[PDB]
Paper text:
P-glycoprotein (Pgp, also known as MDR-1 and [name]) is a prominent member of the human ATP-binding cassette (ABC) efflux transporters that removes a large variety of chemically unrelated hydrophobic compounds from cells. For Pgp and ABC transporters in general, ATP binding, hydrolysis, and subsequent release of the cleaved products (inorganic phosphate and ADP) fuel large-scale conformational changes that ultimately result in translocation of substrates across the membrane bilayer. To address this fundamental question and overcome the dynamic and transient nature of substrate translocation, we tethered a substrate molecule covalently to specific residues along the putative translocation pathway of Pgp and utilized cryoEM to capture Pgp structures with bound substrate during various stages of transport. In conjunction with molecular dynamics simulations, our structures trace the substrate passage across the membrane and identify conformational changes in transmembrane helix 1 (TM1) as regulators of substrate transport.
L335C in transmembrane helix 6 (TM6) and V978C in TM12 are situated at symmetric positions on opposing TMD halves, while [name] is located two helical turns above V978. Only after adding Mg2+ ATP to fuel substrate translocation, Pgp971 reacted with [name]-DNPT, but Pgp302 did not (data not shown). For Pgp971, we prepared the covalent complex in the presence of Mg2+ ATP and stabilized the resulting OF complex with vanadate in a post-hydrolysis intermediate state. For Pgp978 and Pgp971, only OF conformations with a single bound ligand (OF978-1lig and OF971-1lig) were captured at 2.9 Å and 3 Å resolution, respectively. However, in OF335-1lig, OF978-1lig, and OF971-1lig, TM1 swings out at A63, dilating the transmembrane passage and providing sufficient space for accommodating the bound ligand. Strikingly, along with the upward movement of the ligand (from L335C to V978C to [name]), the TM1 loop is progressively lifted and restabilized. Interestingly, the extracellular gate is sealed in all OF structures, which is especially surprising for OF971-1lig where the ligand is near the tunnel exit. During the last stages of transport (OF971-1lig to OF335-nolig), the TM1-TM2 regulatory loop straightens, and the substrate-interacting hydrophobic residues (M74 and F78) rotate and pivot away from the tunnel, which facilitates the escape of the substrate from the transporter. Although OF971-1lig captured a post-hydrolysis state, we cannot rule out the possibility of ligand release prior to ATP hydrolysis, when it is not covalently bound.
Numbering used by the authors: 34 to 625, 683 to 1271
The structure:
């Protein structure tokens, strides 16, 4: 991985880098050549000659003729000087722009090569690795490359060109002294390389810690609903805090090593100064070198050293970029075993429907010890329907996944028409099969767009036909924005049944040759299920169909039914034979806005948030002023020492006394090293602590918000993660070492100004008359940068949304073969910041050229005015070139200040957004302690005429009116059609939303009056399609009560009560078995049962089951229901179910249509009053 960061540089990028390097070399060798022309070195001082020759220079007119010639030669410089500046105005641009143009073109291509690779890996790779980190790798990690292959390289080459040109000019004039000085540069190289490797290693680890924090944040934000229901905000915050603390610990060490690198560089530069003076004194003692010659070398080898000292940060940035490019290119270079982008494979023109499963042995990559399938055999002829039945966790979804070739069977072969599916092209194979997953997942787009994912070239007529066949037409057209209605992420703004019909339509619209249904009627009502099964029965002969069901009514008419037992199919035949066979199937059947742009002082408000670190800042600013004012003060000291050296007395004893002055240079080097390290370290550590607390506060505020805040289409999971990372990563770029260099530069300007006024006079006016133009350049830059910051942030959250949406839902994306579509969407999202980067590149080039050229112009104007003033005789020739050094350093510091305004402009907008998110208080405040906390509750729930509509489609009334009353130790059953609002009442009892009209009572007390945390802790909830975190089984069960430490014994009791303890015991690592993202490393039944155990371990007073047996075998349903019935006494229970067997025993059943409470009563009462309930019970008859 050495020197591979530029893998994606084409010919245009190569010429950009080459011409930029040449321009950088030209711009660097300017300073060596400004001295080489003024290297004639024999004009010396006529006045210095005058102290010796005052008797000779007593003549008034001949001393004037000298002064007048001095003008002539001085203007001779200011001419050349101006020309030099003109040249800079070209070459400076040509470097920065081009290097930036070479970086933006590669960073843009890296992101597309990264994401493509992410979409190229297979399902086993996603199962093994933690993919929640990938999102940060896309946003933060690649960003660290952008700052290390840009114009920083150009400025590095500029400084090294300055250094080496000065050393070569020095070699031509004074060779020995030059070798003695150059013998130190290997130490600089060794130090810089060692510090660079250390810094790169630390950056790798810091990026890893940030990726882990991002994975935690993404997992929490995707399951925020279960987080809020169980009150788990503090534990997620603590996990985030631990990752942030590790990242801060790494960042502090990074700051320490970078600052120690800079300090060591400066120390060794001053040591080189001392060595040069000592060798020069020795040489003039041996008389081998003319004193003139010694100043020729000194004045030619001693500025590129400070150039290298200034170039150290570019080395740091490149090291950080190399450290960041590790994981990105490791993922890029990976090659899938099952390649879905390969063009080499069989693509049969005619395909019938014969499936073959011979001797299928398979174990998942994550759990190799556990065997799932062992000798599986299955023959599926064409036009036939083969149903898969058995206990939950048997391996039916595994077989359906093997059909799509998401995994390679370990033993045996899966084949179509006698051809191994390995030989057939992966994309072609996955394109000819339609799939409905067990809990179907949609994307955060319109209904029509979601259906269009199944097949791209579908007309509205075909979409409508598929929707009609899927029994989804009525609710779609009942919605405003019929096919343009926005569904939430993971289709969470539709009901479970509606989402399932949308997925069925998506699978049907691609006219599959092989149809795969994974319990496609799990969330449907008996009437909806009957309609859907009839519709798929009408068109069945054209395509073979494999179906998995726990509702055996759909299986009743299947051509062939296969039963699972021990990873093999034990029974195989039609309904008649299997009932005659008296086997597992028989038992299963017989079982019974803009906000005022950006406010000023937002960045000031962030810094004021970092007020506990005031000693750090005061120490840093004292060190900054000291080491900033040293450089002009060191220039004055150098001038005085040179004046002593050139006019040294005849004894050699005092030449050694100036050699004693060389120790003052070592003292200055040591003190500069201390001050540089101190200021850098203090500012870096303060910035790190500010960044850590800033991300902590932003995430804490995010967890505080209402559910209505998460349903907002701008607040998606990917958008939230991108905002969380970026809003704090942009403040960091203007609060660390950059504020330190700002303070150093303002101190430098002040010191240079003070030196200018005292030593000479009237050249200070020039130094003040120039600052406004550099300020104007800064302003004209800052305007464009401020606009682009808002635009880039807004459109970067859009790309983060796409990336997270694709990564989290990768199995659906692969099943639908939509990797190319998501790459295209990602690129289209990336397009705008690309052009912003190009414009920003050219703007930086222009600004840099202007600042440097105006520096040279200021030098030329200084010499012009100095010559004109020497014509007035007001001030001597020593001060004119001293104030020249002062103006040089001060104006250059002011120019370097200007390269910061873009960062300040981004930091102020990020600061404003961070302040806005932190102070946002919700209507239903989770963190609020105020509110009623009853000492005991009777256990009564009353929905006394509740009228509610969701705050995403507020025109639609979801609960037009319904009155419910619940007594302690009773049981409500909630039945009805899909979309009737059964889940809505449970979400209201959870205080996820607040009803407009009506009210909800707990023991006759308004729910708003009670404390939200207490109310949520008094009740336990199981949702329609449960979400399990990517942790151990016991950790997921222990999530039931976060206000105490749940015992392992209690976890085992809860697991046993939920009919899951057997499976967990059978697993290696037992309850410590790690379940994957969203519980996808378990089956639907096991995940549901573990969710039941989680809601049971807390022993709630109010139990809220929401289709808690939706994905469960009838034998598992019976056991779970009888266990629930044992504890029905002394426990209020509310049950939402579409399978009516678990409902007959309930104390009372309420049938709701479209949000109304029309029918209620016991099972006998509802069965007697023939109507909706009687029709639902007797659908199959
Ligand atoms: C900021 C400081 C610390 C930079 C220190 C590292 C430099 C020595 C690097 C940075 C940019 C690099 C250049 C960027 C890209 C290329 C293209 C590269 O061409 C390739 O793609 C590889 C060779 C080939 O196959 O032709 C040749 C080296 C070169 C000029 C690199 C040479 C090494 C450079 C100058
Ligand atoms: C031929 C050289 C050794 C003569 C001495 C030249 C010097 C002026 C020094 C000062 C800074 C040095 C550079 C500091 C930074 C680096 C990066 C470092 O290599 C890496 O990039 C290491 C990997 C990483 O970045 O983590 C060592 C080489 C190089 C180009 C150094 C080369 C030698 C340089 C130019
Ligand atoms: S003029 C202010 C500063 N120079 C000195 O303080 C100084 C003391 S003694 C001395 N310079 C000897 C006489 N100078 C040289 O030998 C010499 C050769 S080339 C050269 N100076 C170039 C033209 N000087 C500078 O660039 C320069 C900037 S500030 C400065 N000297
Ligand atoms: N990605 C995975 N990694 C590891 N183990 C898995 C993975 N997916 C499933 N398993 C396990 O392998 C077994 C097969 O479960 P599978 O999903 O095939 O069941 P199923 O027949 O679809 O049942 P259900 O009716 O519960 O949906 C189960 O024990 C399950 O926990
Ligand atoms: N978060 C949401 N935002 C907007 N509308 C929603 C949201 N959740 C549900 N809806 C809509 O409100 C209505 C209420 O449906 P709800 O989910 O309450 O039904 P349900 O009885 O739980 O359904 P099922 O039995 O299919 O699970 C439906 O029309 C649904 O599309
Ligand atoms: Mg399954
Ligand atoms: Mg529901």
């Amino acid at each position: 991985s050495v020197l591979t960061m530029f893998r994606y540089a084409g010919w245009l990028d190569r010429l950009y880098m080459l011409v930029g390097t040449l321009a950088a070399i030209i711009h660097g060798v300017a300073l060596p050549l400004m001295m080489l022309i003024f290297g004639d070195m024999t004009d010396s001082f006529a006045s210095v000659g005058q102290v010796s020759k005052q008797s000779t220079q007593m003549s008034e007119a001949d001393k004037r003729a000298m002064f007048a010639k001095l003008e002539e030669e001085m203007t001779t410089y200011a001419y050349y000087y101006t020309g030099i500046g003109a040249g800079v105005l070209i070459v400076a641009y040509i470097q920065v722009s081009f290097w930036a143009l070479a970086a933006g073109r590669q960073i843009h291509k890296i992101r597309q090569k990264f994401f493509h690779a992410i979409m190229n890996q297979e399902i086993g790779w996603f199962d093994v690795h933690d993919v929640g980190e990938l999102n940060t790798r896309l946003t933060d990690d690649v960003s660290k490359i952008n700052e290390g292959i840009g114009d920083k390289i150009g400025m590095f080459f500029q400084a090294m060109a300055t250094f080496f040109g000065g050393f070569i000019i020095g070699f031509t004039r004074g060779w020995k002294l030059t070798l003695v000085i150059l013998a130190i540069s290997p130490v600089l190289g060794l130090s810089a390389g060692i510090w660079a490797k250390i810094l790169s290693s630390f950056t790798d680890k810091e990026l890893h810690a940030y990726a882990k924090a991002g994975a935690v944040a993404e997992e929490v934000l995707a399951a925020i609903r279960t987080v809020i229901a169980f009150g788990g905000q503090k534990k997620e915050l603590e996990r985030y805090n631990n990752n942030l603390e590790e990242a801060k610990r790494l960042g502090i060490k990074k700051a320490i090593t970078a600052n120690i690198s800079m300090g060591a560089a400066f120390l060794l530069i001053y040591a080189s100064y001392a060595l040069a003076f000592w060798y020069g004194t020795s040489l003039v003692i041996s008389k081998e070198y003319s004193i003139g010659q010694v100043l020729t070398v000194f004045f030619s080898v001693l500025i590129g050293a400070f150039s290298v000292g200034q170039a150290s940060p570019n080395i740091e940035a490149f090291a950080n970029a190399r450290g960041a490019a590790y994981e990105v290119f490791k993922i890029i270079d990976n090659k899938p075993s099952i390649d879905s982008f390969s063009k080499s494979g069989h693509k049969p023109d005619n395909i019938q429907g014969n499936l073959e499963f011979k001797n299928i042995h398979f174990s998942y990559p994550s759990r190799k010890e556990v065997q799932i399938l062992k000798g599986l055999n299955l023959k599926v002829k064409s036009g036939q329907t083969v149903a898969l039945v058995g206990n939950s966790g048997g391996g039916k979804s595994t077989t359906v996944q093997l059909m799509q070739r998401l995994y390679d069977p370990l033993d045996g072969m899966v084949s179509i028409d006698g051809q191994d599916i390995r030989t057939i092209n992966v994309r072609y194979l996955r394109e000819i099969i339609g799939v409905v997953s067990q809990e179907p997942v949609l994307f955060a787009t319109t209904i029509a767009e979601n259906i269009r994912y199944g097949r791209e070239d579908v007309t509205m007529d075909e979409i409508e036909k598929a929707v009609k066949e899927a029994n989804a037409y009525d609710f779609i057209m009942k919605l405003p924005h019929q096919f343009d209605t926005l569904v939430g992420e993971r289709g969470a703004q539709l009901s479970g049944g509606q989402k399932q019909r949308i997925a069925i339509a998506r699978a049907l619209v691609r006219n599959p040759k092989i149809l795969l249904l994974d319990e496609a009627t799990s969330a449907l009502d008996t009437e909806s299920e009957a309609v859907v099964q009839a519709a798929l029965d009408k068109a069945r002969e054209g395509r073979t169909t494999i179906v998995i069901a726990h509702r055996l009514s759909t299986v009743r008419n299947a051509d062939v039914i296969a039963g699972f037992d021990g990873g093999v199919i034990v029974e195989q035949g039609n309904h008649d034979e299997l009932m005659r066979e008296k086997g597992i199937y028989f038992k299963l059947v017989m079982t019974q806005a803009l906000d005022e742009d950006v406010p000023p002082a937002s960045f000031w408000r962030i810094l004021k948030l970092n007020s506990t670190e005031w000693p750090y800042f005061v120490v840093g600013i004292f060190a900054a002023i000291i080491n900033g004012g040293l450089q002009p003060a060191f220039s004055v000291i150098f001038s005085k020492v040179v004046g002593v050296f050139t006019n040294g007395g005849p004894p050699e004893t005092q030449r050694q006394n100036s050699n004693l002055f060389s120790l003052l240079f070592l003292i200055l080097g040591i003190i500069s090293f201390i001050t540089f390290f101190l200021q850098g370290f203090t500012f870096g550590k303060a910035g790190e602590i500010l960044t850590k607390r800033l991300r902590y506060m932003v995430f804490k505020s995010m967890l505080r918000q209402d559910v209505s805040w998460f349903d907002d289409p701008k607040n998606t999971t990917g958008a939230l993660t991108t905002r969380l990372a970026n809003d704090a990563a942009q403040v960091k770029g203007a609060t660390g070492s950059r504020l330190a260099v700002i303070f150093q530069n303002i101190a430098n300007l002040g010191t240079g100004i003070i030196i200018s006024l005292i030593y000479g006079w009237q050249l200070t006016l020039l130094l003040l008359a120039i600052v406004p133009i550099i300020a104007i350049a800064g302003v004209v830059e800052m305007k464009m940068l401020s606009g682009q910051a808002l635009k880039d942030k807004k459109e970067l959250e859009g790309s983060g949304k796409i990336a997270t949406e694709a990564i989290e839902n990768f199995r659906t994306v692969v099943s639908l073969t939509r990797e190319q579509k998501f790459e295209t969407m990602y690129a289209q999202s990336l397009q705008i910041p690309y052009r912003n980067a190009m414009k920003k590149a050219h703007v930086f080039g222009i600004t840099f050229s202007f600042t440097q050229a105006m520096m040279y112009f200021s030098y030329a104007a200084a010499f012009r005015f100095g010559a004109y003033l020497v014509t007035q005789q007001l001030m001597t020739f020593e001060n004119v070139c001293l104030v020249f050094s002062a103006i040089v350093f001060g104006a250059m510091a002011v120019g370097q200040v200007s390269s910061f305004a873009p960062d300040y402009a981004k930091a102020t907008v990020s600061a404003s957004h961070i302040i806005r998110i932190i102070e946002k208080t919700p209507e239903i405040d989770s963190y609020s302690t105020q509110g009623l906390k009853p000492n005991m509750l009777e256990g009564n729930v009353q929905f006394s005429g509740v009228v509610f509509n969701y705050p995403t489609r507020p025109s639609i009334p979801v609960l037009q009116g319904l009155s419910l009353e619940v007594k302690k130790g009773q049981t409500l059953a909630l039945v009805g059609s899909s979309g009737g609002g059964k889940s809505t009442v449970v979400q209201l009892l959870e205080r996820f939303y607040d009803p407009m009209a009506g009210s909800v009572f707990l023991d006759g007390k308004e729910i708003k009056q009670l404390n939200v945390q207490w109310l949520r802790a008094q009740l336990g909830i199981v949702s329609q399609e449960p979400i399990l975190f990517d942790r151990s089984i016991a950790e997921n069960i222990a999530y039931g009560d976060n206000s105490r430490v749940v015992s392992y014994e209690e976890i085992v009791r809860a697991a046993k009560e939920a009919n899951i303890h057997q499976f967990i015991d059978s697993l290696p690592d037992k309850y410590n078995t790690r379940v994957g993202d969203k519980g996808t490393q378990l089956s639907g039944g096991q995940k549901q049962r573990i969710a039941i155990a989680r809601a049971l371990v807390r022993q709630p007073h109010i139990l809220l089951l929401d289709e808690a047996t939706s994905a469960l075998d009838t034998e598992s349903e019976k056991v779970v229901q009888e266990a629930l019935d044992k504890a029905r006494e002394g426990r209020t229970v509310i049950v939402i179910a579409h399978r009516l067997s678990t409902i007959q025993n309930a104390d009372l059943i309420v049938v709701i249509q479209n949000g109304k409470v029309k029918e209620h009563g016991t099972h006998q009462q509802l069965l007697a009053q023939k109507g909706i309930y009687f029709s639902m019970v007797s659908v199959q008859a």
